Amino acid sequence: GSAKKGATLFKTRCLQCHTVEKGGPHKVGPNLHGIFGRHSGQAEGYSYTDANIKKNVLWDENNMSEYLTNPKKYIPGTKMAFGGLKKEKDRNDLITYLKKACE
Amino acid sequence: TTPLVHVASVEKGRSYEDFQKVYNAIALKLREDDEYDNYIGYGPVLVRLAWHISGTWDKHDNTGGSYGGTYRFKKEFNDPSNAGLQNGFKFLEPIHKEFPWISSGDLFSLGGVTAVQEMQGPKIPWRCGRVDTPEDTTPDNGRLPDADKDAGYVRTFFQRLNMNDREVVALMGAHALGKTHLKNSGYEGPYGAANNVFTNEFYLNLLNEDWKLEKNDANNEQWDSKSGYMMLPTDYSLIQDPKYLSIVKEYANDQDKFFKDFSKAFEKLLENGITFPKDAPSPFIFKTLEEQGL
Numbered sequence: 001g002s003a004k005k006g007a008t009l010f011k012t013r014c015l016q017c018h019t020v021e022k023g024g025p026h027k028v029g030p031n032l033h034g035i036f037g038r039h040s041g042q043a044e045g046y047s048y049t050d051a052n053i054k055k056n057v058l059w060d061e062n063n064m065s066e067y068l069t070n071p072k073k074y075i076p077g078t079k080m081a082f083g084g085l086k087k088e089k090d091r092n093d094l095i096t097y098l099k100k101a102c103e
Numbered sequence: 104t105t106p107l108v109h110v111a112s113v114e115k116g117r118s119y120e121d122f123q124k125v126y127n128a129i130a131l132k133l134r135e136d137d138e139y140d141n142y143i144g145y146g147p148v149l150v151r152l153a154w155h156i157s158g159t160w161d162k163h164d165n166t167g168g169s170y171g172g173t174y175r176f177k178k179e180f181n182d183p184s185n186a187g188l189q190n191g192f193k194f195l196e197p198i199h200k201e202f203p204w205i206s207s208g209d210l211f212s213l214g215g216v217t218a219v220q221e222m223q224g225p226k227i228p229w230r231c232g233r234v235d236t237p238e239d240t241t242p243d244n245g246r247l248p249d250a251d252k253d254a255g256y257v258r259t260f261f262q263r264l265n266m267n268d269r270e271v272v273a274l275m276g277a278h279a280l281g282k283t284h285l286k287n288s289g290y291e292g293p294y295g296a297a298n299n300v301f302t303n304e305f306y307l308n309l310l311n312e313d314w315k316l317e318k319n320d321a322n323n324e325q326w327d328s329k330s331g332y333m334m335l336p337t338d339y340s341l342i343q344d345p346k347y348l349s350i351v352k353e354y355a356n357d358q359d360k361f362f363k364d365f366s367k368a369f370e371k372l373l374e375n376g377i378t379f380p381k382d383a384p385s386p387f388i389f390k391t392l393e394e395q396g397l
């Protein structure tokens with residue numbers, strides 16, 4: 001749908017934690033550059049949990065929506081603190097905004 | 104003298120599920136309008152509203168408290184320290200007209216517990232029986248703590264609310280939620296990375312992040328972090344005191360005890376000034392929308 005409204009969603013709901021464009025910030029969440037679902041985590045040496053590596057998951061936009069809907073129910077024991085995206089439309093706005101910056 | 108005795112009188116014929124439908128209504132609109140305050144939501148402001156009505160309580164004369172539900176008046180609505188909480192009030196009013204039987208005191212106090220639980224916080228026992236009272240029960244202005252002070256002021260102020268060191272530090276953990284705005288308070292910046300998620304983050308970024316005392320645009324002096332975090336001098340005075348410091352570092356590595364102690368203190372906070380009878384029902388534990396399959 002709309003990738004330009006996903007820019008606004010990512011700014012308020014994500015940007016304070018992640019960053020897509022550089023590869024060095026590693027604030028709270030790991031860098032989101034090039035997420036087609038490498039597998040679980042990507043290593044600058046960013047300290048991960050024991051939950052993510054378990055059960056490797058390709059981050060395809062359909063399952064990504066599940067993870068953004070309920071981060072806790074999708075991966076129990078995740079360090080990521082996010083309520084979720086309960087709406088369906090705002091997901092399809094944010095998930096598209098990502099992969100064009102993942103070039 | 105005959106000190107003020109506020110008896111808890113349950114609403115007519117109402118019970119658990121009757122208040123649960125109010126919970127669900129609040130929790131729904133909380134999920135409905137998520138576009139309030141740059142996608143933070145009404146979560147934090149409903150918590151702060153719940154503490155502001157319970158912060159007017161004075162243990163000496165038993166004046167104020169959340170029992171009154173007097174927030175519908177003029178005198179306490181326009182308070183300079185109360186600004187920004189009008190939004191939380193207009194949040195609960197459309198819900199107050201669909202359940203005309205429920206009192207404001209229970210509605211405001213139910214909004215805060217509802218907010219905490221829906222924000223992935225601890226289960227907070229809630230009791231009913233707060234009845235509305237005439238205009239002479241309204242507490243005066245200035246019973247709320249000043250944003251610019253030290254730890255001595257903090258420990259002294261909460262004695263009026265009958266709170267010890269452990270309860271003060273625990274209750275202060277609710278400051279991991281939301282942000283501050285100049286347009287009411289005069290301070291700027293988010294408290295933590297996760298605004299609408301209830302976490303022990305408040306204690307974590309306090310003992311880790313580098314804090315430097317600086318000046319905002321209101322000429323007020325606040326503590327800023329390199330990560331973009333902010334804290335008030337009284338929030339920061341927790342590590343400026345030895346007694347408060349050990350409790351902060353306890354809640355840092357242990358999140359569950361914080362969740363456990365907050366639920367105790369926050370419940371104690373909302374029930375202050377209320378005299379419960381011996382036949383009053385056990386405290387309610389409401390079901391979250393996630394537990395109901397939503």
Ligand code: HEC
Pocket residue numbers: 009010013014016017018028029030040041042047048049051052067068077078079080081082094296297298
């Ligand atoms: C902190 C306040 C965060 C907010 C808000 C959001 N995320 Fe997050 N994210 C955060 C952490 C600490 C972690 C690591 C979890 C762990 O177990 O180590 C993550 C992780 C992710 C991931 C997976 C990355 C990976 O597994 O390597 C994704 C896909 C992700 N985050 C996305 C995401 C989006 C889209 C958000 C808002 C719109 C968002 N997160 C919020 C911290 C925080």
Ligand code: HEC
Pocket residue numbers: 147148150151154186187248249250251257274275277278280281282283284285287288289290335337369
């Ligand atoms: C139990 C809950 C609780 C307690 C106790 C508490 N706070 Fe708060 N406070 C909040 C919440 C939640 C917010 C976030 C408001 C928002 O996001 O709109 C807040 C925000 C604030 C703000 C800014 C509000 C605005 O709109 O800019 C100030 C100032 C403040 N707190 C001062 C204090 C002081 C001073 C104390 C104690 C000495 C204190 N608080 C204790 C819950 C609490």
